[PDB]
Ligand binder design. Structure first.
Ligand SMILES: *[C@@H]1O[C@H](CO)[C@@H](O[C@@H]2O[C@H](CO)[C@@H](O[C@@H]3O[C@H](CO[C@H]4O[C@H](CO)[C@@H](O)[C@H](O)[C@@H]4O)[C@@H](O)[C@H](O[C@H]4O[C@H](CO)[C@@H](O)[C@H](O)[C@@H]4O)[C@@H]3O)[C@H](O)[C@H]2NC(C)=O)[C@H](O)[C@H]1NC(C)=O
Ligand SMILES: *[C@@H]1O[C@H](CO)[C@@H](O[C@@H]2O[C@H](CO)[C@@H](O[C@@H]3O[C@H](CO[C@H]4O[C@H](CO)[C@@H](O)[C@H](O)[C@@H]4O)[C@@H](O)[C@H](O[C@H]4O[C@H](CO)[C@@H](O)[C@H](O)[C@@H]4O)[C@@H]3O)[C@H](O)[C@H]2NC(C)=O)[C@H](O)[C@H]1NC(C)=O
Ligand SMILES: *[C@@H]1O[C@H](CO)[C@@H](O[C@@H]2O[C@H](CO)[C@@H](O[C@H]3O[C@H](CO[C@H]4O[C@H](CO)[C@@H](O)[C@H](O)[C@@H]4O)[C@@H](O)[C@H](O[C@H]4O[C@H](CO)[C@@H](O)[C@H](O)[C@@H]4O)[C@@H]3O)[C@H](O)[C@H]2NC(C)=O)[C@H](O)[C@H]1NC(C)=O
Ligand SMILES: *[C@@H]1O[C@H](CO)[C@@H](O[C@@H]2O[C@H](CO)[C@@H](O[C@H]3O[C@H](CO[C@H]4O[C@H](CO)[C@@H](O)[C@H](O)[C@@H]4O)[C@@H](O)[C@H](O[C@H]4O[C@H](CO)[C@@H](O)[C@H](O)[C@@H]4O)[C@@H]3O)[C@H](O)[C@H]2NC(C)=O)[C@H](O)[C@H]1NC(C)=O
Ligand SMILES: *[C@@H]1O[C@H](CO)[C@@H](O[C@@H]2O[C@H](CO)[C@@H](O)[C@H](O)[C@H]2NC(C)=O)[C@H](O)[C@H]1NC(C)=O
Ligand SMILES: *[C@@H]1O[C@H](CO)[C@@H](O[C@@H]2O[C@H](CO)[C@@H](O)[C@H](O)[C@H]2NC(C)=O)[C@H](O)[C@H]1NC(C)=O
Ligand SMILES: *[C@@H]1O[C@H](CO)[C@@H](O[C@@H]2O[C@H](CO)[C@@H](O)[C@H](O)[C@H]2NC(C)=O)[C@H](O)[C@H]1NC(C)=O
Ligand SMILES: *[C@@H]1O[C@H](CO)[C@@H](O)[C@H](O)[C@H]1NC(C)=O
Ligand SMILES: *[C@@H]1O[C@H](CO)[C@@H](O)[C@H](O)[C@H]1NC(C)=O
Lengths: 107, 171, 426, 426, 107
């Protein structure tokens, strides 16, 4: 089908996950075609690797697009020591890699 | 002959401190009674050990003991001071290899800090708290005039110096 | 692996991240740490119509368990709508149901601050019969709060401490007072103030202090000289530790910043003194800008015979700033002293107290041994003053009769330097 | 015995014990501490009638001084009326008048109390980089209140601290916060919270804490000042013994001369300090000719708990002599210092080191506290120098702009004084 | 003349005297007859001796009575070491010895 841009969203971990002692920062890429999407994790403007898990669905039957969720798993202390968390999405439908970020102070 | 022993061994004490002079020799003659000689005058003590209680300035001076033998004991000397720091020493003349303990002692069990010993002017050893310098194998070069600087109740005090001299045990 | 139930957590964007004009919002639930597959997730959206979506699970590398995210996209009055997600794991049990109920903007995390204040000992440094500790939770959005004290990690009886709460404007303040015996304080136990606010735990701790001279050692840590800092632009700080024992085993000296940024190497130097003690001195070069912006520098010394590490810390002043006034005078001729004069420089009303004074003749700075300057002492009002004195010879003023008294001080503008010239003939 | 001026104090019954319906009241003034008899007391009652009656004096056993009580009995509007007692002691001086003005009732208010809390060091025993001191003035009757912080007794600038007052119901509460660097706190300085409320002073103290505070007695012995020797012509020496532990018993303090000639009677003051010690000061008058001809005086300090006697001695310096050079200066006018100026004085090339510096203005020698004077330091060549700094106000130089710096020194000629005038405008 | 009772009064030291470092607690016995008047000082119900000085006046010219003031002299520190201060007056005009008392902190 046509090239669809990902709607990029970023979800912080819940406080209940911090009570459990872990932290899962989610980056959702909604309704993108083709499947070749790259997600990069910038924690305090530092590139992260080896601590990210990407879940990709099958081709949808309505719009023929894809949905991806990249999960950055960290500890509670490792989450609380860092301040700004961002996910950068490179895709054909985006002219520039779109960076979606949040801050621990306001979340 | 009966030699004279000191408990504690230290012939230099503070005012008010105790010490007990004991005096014994080979038991060729059985021990019945002893004579004491403060300065030369006969003391009114028969017992083989005389307990010198609460030192006064007049408690200084030459001491000597005697038994029913025909001949006397050596002129041990006991100087008594009132001051802040007395650098005590085991014996005033020693022969190599005998134990020697030194102790920079403060008035009435008080604790002297930042203690430094001096041997002939140079700094032999320094320790944070008071310590027991101990040389078991005295050398002939160990002979010197010693003194110790200390810190008692935040103030600095130097002890009066005391000269000690070793000799060669052969001859 | 073993059978483990999922831990179910919500997943909603921050309330400041969701636009207010959004016609639709996506939320979700993360079910993590379950094994083996599968789980079944449903959504109760109330009266709103929404699209659910179940992703394939991602296997956790550290345990081998699975982690999945179940999303839901809704439209309409989603802000006020209460959303439930219902997770079941049929390997675990046939009726194990985790129902997590939450709104899209349930709450943002709000960190209350924690601080511990304590009783005085008196003017002779003696402890009082009891010790008061006051835990302060100052300036937070009002809500449910609990305060618990631990003594070496065990909860102490509720009647041993009392808590109270006030409000000012929007911000709340809470305090709690704990009474300890002198003996307990002196046993070196650790006391922890545990504040539980909206279900989340915040902590601070204390124990008997450490009074900077464990074995009679002293340590001192200087600030940069203003001359080194602003004129040479090579500021240094110096850590000197005295009255250590000359024993074996080298002392461990380490430098650090409170921010954790790197420090350079220093000039570590040891030397035995004439009194039989050992002094260790180290000089560290520091960044000029780093110092001016208020960095804190820490010197840390460990010796094998010391029972614990000894630390000293230094930082820039926290008081106000005032530039120095500089006045310079030449003495008139005194009968019988044709070939000498004295120059006097008054430097005053500056804040903070750190200052450098130099004298110059013929555009070159004279040796420090030529002049005498007093130590900073307080004026009658704001700031400090010093005097500087320089004796000069006839050959010098006949060579050039203009001499400059220059003060370097952190508050002087535009280059932390102010000077005044003087002439002896006029 | 020397002529002693009386100290006059009020004597009113306490108003809770005074009945409100009592139409008449008796008040009085106690004049105590004078040599020789008599004193005369007069009473100003305002507008009411009054009966004045003076008792015979009582000779104090300990010091031999005289103590007399002069009572006034009044009726009418007694509780709202000002009352003055005027005591004259013509042996002291013919115009000697002590004026004491007060009321029957100074009214009843609840006592304020003061306590100081501090930051806790952390879980490792380390100080934070700044120290907060919180002076708390608990519930008192609302009124005007001031808080001053002192560092080893000297007032710090109010800019370095904050203060806050709240009122709850009918009761006020006050807090004051002072911020200190870690360096100043670790230097063992003592800090005082000074509360002034309705003309009554409260106080509290703190210093860096400690697990233990050993301290021992120290002693210092001064020479007479040149000013006292040659202007006042009444030289004294002072033996000051500080940091003794307040054990059981009085400290034995004896003056003697190496020549065996008699000493005069000395005076002795003993004063408990904020910091927990007892400071004993003994002041001995010395003969002027005795001192000038080279007598040596000894202070000997004994106490049962001391190891040995502490001995100090003092005598005229045996070095050579040289007269002071004097130079007085005014700083220029510039912005921000229109109605306050600074004057300075350089005194130099004198020998020996003991010198007294004063400032004189308009036929009065101003109090020493108005100015500051540095400690004598060696000049590069021969002799010592000091600087003195005096801040002055517009009203003083508009009164008279001639300010005289005066040095008193043993080598000055022809009368052991040297002085120089300066005018700021010229 | 007839027997006149002493008017018993007590006066604390002033705060200025406490600044001076001394203390003089006064018990005044105004206008009594005959001259035989006994003043006993107690401090926290402990009898004092050696620091009480009784200034006894002459016979008054109007009512033929006498006046007395007993002055208990103490130090400042010894003054604030105690709370209750009282004076007991025994005289012919009093059937019982009258004790007048006060406290430090109430004043
Ligand atoms: C055996 O001999 C050694 C020397 O070989 C002695 O070591 C000395 O120990 C003293 C005590 O600490 C040292 O004195 C200290 O010097 C510091 C150096 O500061 C320099 O920088 C400042 C600022 O520029 C200058 O003003 C200063 O003149 C120095 O140039 C001072 O900072 C220290 O100040 C401390 O005391 C003052 C009060 O005097 C306080 O106000 C301060 O806050 C601070 O606490 C102090 O004066 C001395 O420097 C050491 N010697 C050497 C060569 O370094 C041993 O003490 C000795 N052994 C025994 C047992 O005494
Ligand atoms: C607990 O609290 C008490 C009270 O505050 C402290 O007592 C202070 O102790 C210090 C020293 O221990 C005293 O300082 C000494 O003061 C002497 C008095 O001189 C004054 O008078 C002459 C006039 O003739 C003035 O010119 C002079 O400037 C002083 O104003 C000085 O003579 C002493 O000098 C000696 O020491 C210096 C080195 O410091 C030498 O260079 C001198 O040659 C001389 O030998 C000394 O300065 C201080 O005065 C005491 N306070 C009061 C109010 O008297 C305790 O120290 C304190 N303890 C603790 C642990 O905090
Ligand atoms: C046996 O013979 C001994 C010697 O043959 C006799 O010993 C001598 O006794 C006298 C008096 O008992 C000692 O004199 C000491 O006392 C006077 C007075 O004391 C005052 O000064 C002391 C100074 O140290 C202070 O500390 C005191 O508190 C007090 O104020 C002192 O003047 C002497 O000091 C002099 O000598 C000492 C050394 O002893 C020095 O350190 C001093 O600086 C000063 O020079 C003495 O303290 C005398 O010292 C002592 N001889 C010796 C060698 O110690 C003894 O009396 C005698 N016994 C009998 C029973 O006959
Ligand atoms: C423990 O150590 C102490 C420290 O060394 C010893 O004390 C020392 O004692 C000796 C004495 O043997 C002292 O030596 C001389 O002391 C003075 C100073 O002499 C000065 O004048 C001389 C001219 O008269 C010069 O030639 C010298 O160079 C010097 O400038 C002399 O007066 C002494 O003379 C005494 O001894 C001679 C015999 O040698 C007699 O004939 C004299 O009549 C007189 O009695 C000494 O020559 C030395 O100064 C001294 N040290 C100190 C630091 O004071 C102490 O003896 C020792 N004790 C033990 C048990 O070992
Ligand atoms: C020196 O020795 C004497 C002798 O033992 C000590 O005297 C004792 O003193 C204690 C209390 O001070 C008494 O309870 C004992 O009964 C005493 N002993 C005798 C035998 O009477 C004296 O205390 C010692 N001095 C010091 C400073 O320790
Ligand atoms: C010390 O003891 C010895 C042991 O006998 C004494 O020796 C004899 O002393 C007398 C002294 O009158 C001599 O006449 C003898 O000849 C000695 N015997 C020898 C040398 O074999 C010695 O005299 C004693 N000293 C004193 C001072 O009593
Ligand atoms: C120096 O040595 C002496 C004896 O060798 C020590 O004296 C002993 O001290 C201990 C502990 O204080 C006591 O229990 C003993 O009774 C003492 N013995 C004697 C004979 O006095 C002294 O403590 C040593 N000094 C140091 C610093 O260790
Ligand atoms: C001497 O020794 C005997 C034997 O026990 C003892 O009874 C007596 O008290 C002692 N005398 C002294 C003075 O110690
Ligand atoms: C002293 O040292 C020598 C070394 O030659 C040794 O032979 C002797 O045994 C030592 N003595 C003691 C008491 O240690």
């Amino acid at each position: 089908r046509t090239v669809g841009a990902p709607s990029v969203f970023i979800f912080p971990p819940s406080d209940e996950q911090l009570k459990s002692g872990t932290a899962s920062v989610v980056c959702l890429l909604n309704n993108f075609y083709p499947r070749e999407a790259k997600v990069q994790w910038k924690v305090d403007n530092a590139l992260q690797s080896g601590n990210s898990q990407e879940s990709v669905t099958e081709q949808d039957s309505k719009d023929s697009t894809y949905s991806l969720s990249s999960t950055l798993t960290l500890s509670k202390a490792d989450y609380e020591k860092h301040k700004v968390y961002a996910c950068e999405v490179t895709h054909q439908g985006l002219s520039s890699p779109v960076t979606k970020s949040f801050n621990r102070g306001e979340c | 002959k009966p030699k004279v022993s000191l408990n504690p061994p230290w012939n230099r004490i503070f005012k008010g401190e105790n010490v007990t002079l004991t005096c014994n020799g080979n038991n060729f003659f059985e021990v019945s009674s002893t004579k004491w000689f403060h300065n030369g005058s006969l003391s009114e003590e028969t017992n083989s050990s005389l307990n010198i209680v609460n030192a006064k300035f007049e408690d200084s001076g030459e001491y000597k003991c005697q038994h029913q033998q025909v001949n006397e004991s050596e002129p041990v000397y006991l100087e008594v001071f009132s001051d802040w720091l007395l650098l005590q020493a085991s014996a005033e003349v020693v022969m190599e290899g005998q134990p020697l303990f030194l102790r920079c002692h403060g008035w009435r069990n008080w604790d002297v800090y930042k203690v430094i010993y001096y041997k002939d002017g140079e700094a032999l050893k320094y320790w944070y708290e008071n310590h027991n310098i101990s040389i078991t194998n005295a050398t002939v070069e160990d002979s010197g005039t010693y003194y110790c600087t200390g810190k008692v109740w935040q103030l600095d005090y130097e002890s009066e110096p005391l000269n000690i001299t070793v000799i060669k045990a052969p001859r | 692996a073993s059978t483990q139930s999922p831990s179910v957590f919500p997943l909603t964007r921050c309330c400041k991240n969701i636009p207010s004009n959004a016609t639709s919002v996506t939320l979700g639930c993360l079910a993590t740490g379950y094994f083996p597959e599968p789980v079944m997730v449903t959504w109760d959206t109330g009266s709103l119509n929404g699209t659910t979506m179940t992703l394939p699970a991602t296997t956790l590398t550290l345990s081998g368990h699975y982690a999945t995210i179940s999303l839901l996209t809704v439209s309409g009055a989603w802000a006020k709508q209460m959303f439930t997600c219902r997770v079941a794991h049929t390997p675990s049990s046939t009726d194990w149901v985790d129902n997590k109920t939450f709104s899209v903007c349930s709450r943002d995390f709000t960190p209350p601050t924690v601080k511990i204040l304590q009783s005085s000992c008196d003017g002779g440094g003696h402890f009082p019969p009891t010790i008061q500790l006051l835990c302060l939770v100052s300036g937070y959005t009002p809500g449910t709060i609990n305060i618990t004290w631990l003594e070496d990690g065990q909860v102490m009886d509720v009647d041993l401490s009392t808590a109270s709460t006030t409000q000012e404007g929007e911000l709340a303040s809470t305090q709690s007072e704990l009474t300890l015996s002198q003996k307990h304080w002196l046993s070196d136990r650790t006391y922890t103030c545990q504040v539980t606010y909206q279900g989340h735990t915040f902590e601070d701790s204390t124990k008997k202090c450490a009074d900077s001279n464990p074995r009679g050692v002293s340590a001192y840590l200087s600030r940069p000289s203003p001359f080194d800092l602003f004129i040479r632009k090579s500021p240094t700080i110096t850590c000197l530790v005295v009255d250590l024992a000359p024993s074996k085993g080298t002392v461990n000296l380490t430098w650090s910043r409170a921010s954790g940024k790197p420090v350079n190497h220093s000039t570590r130097k040891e030397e035995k003194q004439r009194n039989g003690t050992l002094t260790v001195t180290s000089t560290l070069p520091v960044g000029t800008r780093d110092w001016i912006e208020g960095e804190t520098y820490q010197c840390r010394v460990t010796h094998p015979h010391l029972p614990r590490a000894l630390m000293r810390s230094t930082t820039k002043t926290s008081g106000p700033r005032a530039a120095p006034e500089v006045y310079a005078f030449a003495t008139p001729e005194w009968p019988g002293s044709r070939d000498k004069r004295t120059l006097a420089c008054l430097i005053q009303n500056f804040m903070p107290e750190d200052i450098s004074v130099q004298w110059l003749h013929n555009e070159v700075q004279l040796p420090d041994a030529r002049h005498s300057t007093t130590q900073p002492r307080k004026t009658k009002g704001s700031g400090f003053f010093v005097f500087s004195r320089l004796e000069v010879t006839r050959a010098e003023w006949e060579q050039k009769d203009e001499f400059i008294c220059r003060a370097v001080h952190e508050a002087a503008s535009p280059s932390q330097t102010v000077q005044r010239a003087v002439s002896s003939v006029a």
